[PDB]
Amino acid sequence: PKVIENVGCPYCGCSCDDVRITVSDDGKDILEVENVCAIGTEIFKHGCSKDRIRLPRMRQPDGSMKDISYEEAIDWTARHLLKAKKPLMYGFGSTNCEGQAAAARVMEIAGGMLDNCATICHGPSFLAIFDNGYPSCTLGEVKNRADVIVYWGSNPAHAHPRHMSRYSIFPRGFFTGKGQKKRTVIVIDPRFTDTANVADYHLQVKQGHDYELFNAFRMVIHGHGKDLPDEVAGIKKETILEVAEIMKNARFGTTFFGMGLTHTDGRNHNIDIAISLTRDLNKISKWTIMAMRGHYNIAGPGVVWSWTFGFPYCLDLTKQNHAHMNPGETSSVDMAMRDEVDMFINIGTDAAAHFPIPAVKQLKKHPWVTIDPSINMASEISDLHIPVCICGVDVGGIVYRMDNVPIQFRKVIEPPEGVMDDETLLNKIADRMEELKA
Amino acid sequence: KTLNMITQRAVEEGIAMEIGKTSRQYFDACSIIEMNEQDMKELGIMKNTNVRVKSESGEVVVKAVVGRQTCYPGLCHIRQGVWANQVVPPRTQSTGAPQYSGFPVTVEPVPNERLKTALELVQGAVGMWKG
Amino acid sequence: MHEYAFFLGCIAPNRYPGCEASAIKTSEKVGIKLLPLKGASCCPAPGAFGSIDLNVWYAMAARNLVLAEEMKKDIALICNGCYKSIWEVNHILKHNDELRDNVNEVLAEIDMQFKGTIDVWHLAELYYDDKVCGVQKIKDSVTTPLSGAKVAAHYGCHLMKPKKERHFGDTENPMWFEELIGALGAEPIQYRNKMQCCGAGGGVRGYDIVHALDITNEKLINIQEAGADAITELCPFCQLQFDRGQIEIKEKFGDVYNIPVLHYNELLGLAQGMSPQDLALDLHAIDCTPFLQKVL
Amino acid sequence: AFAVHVNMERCTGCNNCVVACPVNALELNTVNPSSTDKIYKVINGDAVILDVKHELCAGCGICVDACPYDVIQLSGQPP
Amino acid sequence: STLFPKYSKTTDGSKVIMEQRLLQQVNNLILDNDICTGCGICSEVCPEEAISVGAVGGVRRGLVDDAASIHVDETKCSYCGVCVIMCPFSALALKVDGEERLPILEKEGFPTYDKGTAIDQDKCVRCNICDDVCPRDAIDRDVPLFEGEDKEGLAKGQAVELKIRTVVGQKKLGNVNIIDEDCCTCRWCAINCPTEAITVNKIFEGEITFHAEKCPGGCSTCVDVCPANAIYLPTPKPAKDMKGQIEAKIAVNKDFCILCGACVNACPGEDIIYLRRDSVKIKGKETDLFKKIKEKLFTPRTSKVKEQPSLAGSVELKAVS
Ligand SMILES: Nc1nc2c(c(=O)[nH]1)N[C@H]1C(S)=C(S)[C@@H](COP(=O)(O)OP(=O)(O)OC[C@H]3O[C@@H](n4cnc5c(=O)[nH]c(N)nc54)[C@H](O)[C@@H]3O)O[C@H]1N2
Ligand SMILES: Nc1nc2c(c(=O)[nH]1)N[C@H]1C(S)=C(S)[C@@H](COP(=O)(O)OP(=O)(O)OC[C@H]3O[C@@H](n4cnc5c(=O)[nH]c(N)nc54)[C@H](O)[C@@H]3O)O[C@H]1N2
Ligand code: SF4
Ligand code: SF4
Ligand code: SF4
Ligand code: SF4
Ligand code: SF4
Ligand code: SF4
């Protein structure tokens, strides 16, 4: 019955911080959680569990898995990181920004490849940002000004549940006092998703033809739109002209995109034609692209490694004094394919589940270490499983929202007696490696 | 028959993973095909029956249902997870983003065959399936 | 999540296991938790065993009741005959003192006493009650519409009759079970003499199979005339009669109906998305495939 | 004064029924707020209707039209 | 008991049919739910207090299925037909045996509304504006359809009486009228007619006021349910034109408001809307019943939040002093 305000929900890009927890009398049981979506409710319900991992656990010859002390696990990982020739550390989607700084230091000492879930998720988007730029905005800007909203290839209803009710559509802002009723929502994707149910338009496009769709829109905008064919990408020219007229007349627009663009043919060229469209619309209106980042602090590795090495993802830290970045050559999946690794470290992700199974097969040839709070597929095919605190429930810190706005997450439960957090763990690994004098 | 395919999200799927990747909720949420009613009739797939989704980079036995989110004739959909990534092709096009949406696949109605659990799928792909 | 001991008599586990499997799954999907009963047996089947000896009927039903009494839980049932045995012996021994005494000194030979502390419910009764899962909750849980199917309900006799001994209301033309089928999306149809016995009760199924089959055939004729595509039922006796007896009617007489017979729990599973293989519809004598083509 | 029913089984906690209700929007979005009572609040991930005695709803349909995966049934007949 | 006063209430498609059986005599109060507009001028007028008003916004938007705009207690209704005479948009009909039959008018016991419609065919020019602006489908224009949108009614060149040169005077091909039982006296067609050839007079007179500062924004239920589309959401100004005045949230056009009351019945706010009618315009003399009905219609009203629970399932407004 000790109600705690302003907590952070640590799952989706929304980084919602309007969460209220009613912690038990002893400060270690969560009773009721208000204002959060279900996916979040379950995160907190799992964090407040009574039967949770407390010590590392090693793979014995028999194939079972027995516990070891933290110092022994740190010794194991340090010795292996030094003995290896090009270790790969992957993850960082779900960690505080101190967890993504400590890891950068550890792999600076080691000399391996450091990488995050950007490669497999919105890294194709960054590659377009490198090409064309990122005309964007914070989310309060679309809350307080947006007149048109476009969800191109995204599905907020199931990806980011309270995105619509917090930032985009339903809130009544300052210059949008009328709320939804003066917002025009356009949703583009081949399915008739729940976002399309809520929407007012829908451009059911053939899966994979978004490049042709964007080119049609941009010819319309550039002015001689009469040269369009009868239909484009399955969309009909009159509907194209309708949506384009709405976009032109928008007082302040905003485009959101997701897997519909970053996981189909022409991974980054879809995103950069979208960005070109936004830059073209800002000739006569105000339009701001914006990427639907997935995990809470998945924009955290981007900024932290931007300030540390200058490169958001796919870091080639093997020269030990100059880093390199080329996603086609230094990314986790391509290196796993070309068996270019020597050790895989699972930190803040589920590589076993969410990688292609050929890549997982290629990777498991080498040692495999997992730093997770709870059991998952990586912790089931790893060699040792080091527990760690959960961001936002057992430990606080900074996280980075969809739009690179830092939210400060709070602590609601003390972690089980013995369990440390990743910044302490990565720092101890780095200290032990320097002790081993490499 | 060529039957283009995508792999995407669902709230029940997110809920399931945060219950736990090894839970009955996760099994129920992810082992799912959400295809079109016209395609189900034309192929010969009984609603709520196992089916063999076999692409060039694998194979998986997955329950076949119909989804509210109306897939147009010629589209498939698995909620992302163990089962979908058993069949996702690894081609990246030198970008690091595998072909997670938009790969061809053939669908074969194969009832009377069980579904493979998440642990069984992954630990057997690696060669660790003790149980 | 309400919790009930799941009695699970003889025919559902040993002839139609899909009925019990769907019972557990669908009850869990709605807010009900069905717990196994530890060492329960045949509820002394009211016809074939009550006709022989009422005292041993009382003793065995009381033993089944005191198992769940020790479990400290309320019985949940899926059979009208099991409901008769369990619920009615519970009700009789909650009020008749000399019968309590007699049953107790019979049960004292196995270190076991009846005190009358629990209640007995039919699963469909729970699905209909508003405190427990209601019709609206069933509609919410339904995910496959099952639309465009004509479905005939068979209430049975031991759930609702005699109305001076039960609490379900009118026995002449009840509509409550028709509301549960309408919740699933299937339209329930009305047929002549819908409240007729199926003919399997009282041991007639065994004593005079031709007599029992004639009683069943009267129903099957009325149902076909109405135009049903399946027959829902709340009793494994009645399901066995309507299922086997169609085959025995096809052989002893020359009548062909091919009307699938499904328990309401099996239809609820189909509505909630369970697979036909997971429901074991291959264990029925009468093929359900036309009905599956219609509703799928 | 109508009655709204929320299917808890498919409610995702999206909170677009709370934000869009025009009786909820009375407190913070009106000059000199008249009534500060609220129909819905998302407690434990599902929308709970605090309007137990059916006194504040006006059958507007803004909340039924708002929920992305239809889950709110509006009853226009006396409860 | 006794059975033959069989009271039934069936929803046959889109018509809610309320019936009273006898052996040979029936009584059918039939409400056409596609034309009802959610005003309460049928509940205020009911002599026997049977008609109540339901989920106006939801039903008028299509989000409600198990109800109509209005609920009539057919056990209390007396089948007088006062509701049918006093409904501005005829969405209620009385059928005694099988025919639309109003005994109270047959005996002249009740006045009727003087919508007073007319279109001087010596001034109308077959324009298309009056059919286009009509909020309800009440302009029956009977004109041959020329090459515009169809094959020629006569010919493009015979749309003008030409001697083949000069036009001979005037053309006026066809005939245009106003279905007098459907017009609601909004006056969109009179105010916008090019040749001032339409004569309609509003049935009600009074004033309606909108306190824009009390609308909670995204609630365009009033806009959605207004029959005469008098209400609008005032368009937000562009930048470099706002001039420090932000915007209004809602407003009305008193030229087109017909003082119906659907806006008041639909608004979920507290007192955004103030409705007061001052004079109904009738033909037919009068009655003590009609004076009572005038007194009932002419009481000022406004919205209300948190009405009483005992009447849950209907609407209750605020009595303004
Ligand atoms: N078929 C298909 N597969 C896909 C995709 C697709 O589109 N289709 N998309 C791919 C993409 S977009 C990515 S993001 C992946 C996403 O997939 P992942 O990035 O793997 O996301 P999760 O599986 O939820 O990882 C959560 C794990 O991190 C743990 N954790 C939580 N907090 C912390 C912390 O603070 N510190 C540490 N050390 N651990 C913590 C959690 O307990 C959990 O074990 O899916 C990918 N796989
Ligand atoms: N419950 C739950 N929530 C999540 C996640 C989860 O796994 N479970 N993952 C989180 C993370 S890691 C991610 S990155 C985010 C991302 O989630 P989102 O970026 O919002 O994308 P998706 O949810 O996968 O749905 C993408 C939509 O694009 C459609 N689409 C597919 N192909 C095409 C195409 O070719 N063209 C167009 N125009 N559309 C196409 C798809 O049908 C789908 O409707 O969600 C996060 N939220
Ligand atoms: S939208 Fe995402 S961050 Fe917000 S409450 Fe839901 S899961 Fe948490
Ligand atoms: S119908 Fe309108 S007033 Fe009633 S709960 Fe829904 S949004 Fe609120
Ligand atoms: S809008 Fe729908 S899904 Fe979202 S909280 Fe309300 S009822 Fe639940
Ligand atoms: S008076 Fe109004 S509410 Fe009553 S029937 Fe006529 S249009 Fe409908
Ligand atoms: S016919 Fe008369 S009594 Fe009946 S509802 Fe209409 S006005 Fe009221
Ligand atoms: S608006 Fe006037 S001139 Fe035009 S068609 Fe109508 S009545 Fe005739």
Ligand code: SF4
């Ligand atoms: S007054 Fe209004 S409703 Fe009547 S004919 Fe003119 S435009 Fe139509």
Ligand code: SF4
């Ligand atoms: S503006 Fe006039 S016509 Fe429109 S709803 Fe209000 S009172 Fe009725």
Ligand code: SF4
């Ligand atoms: S006047 Fe009523 S219907 Fe119109 S915006 Fe205000 S509350 Fe909503």
Ligand SMILES: [Mo]
């Ligand atoms: Mo992601």
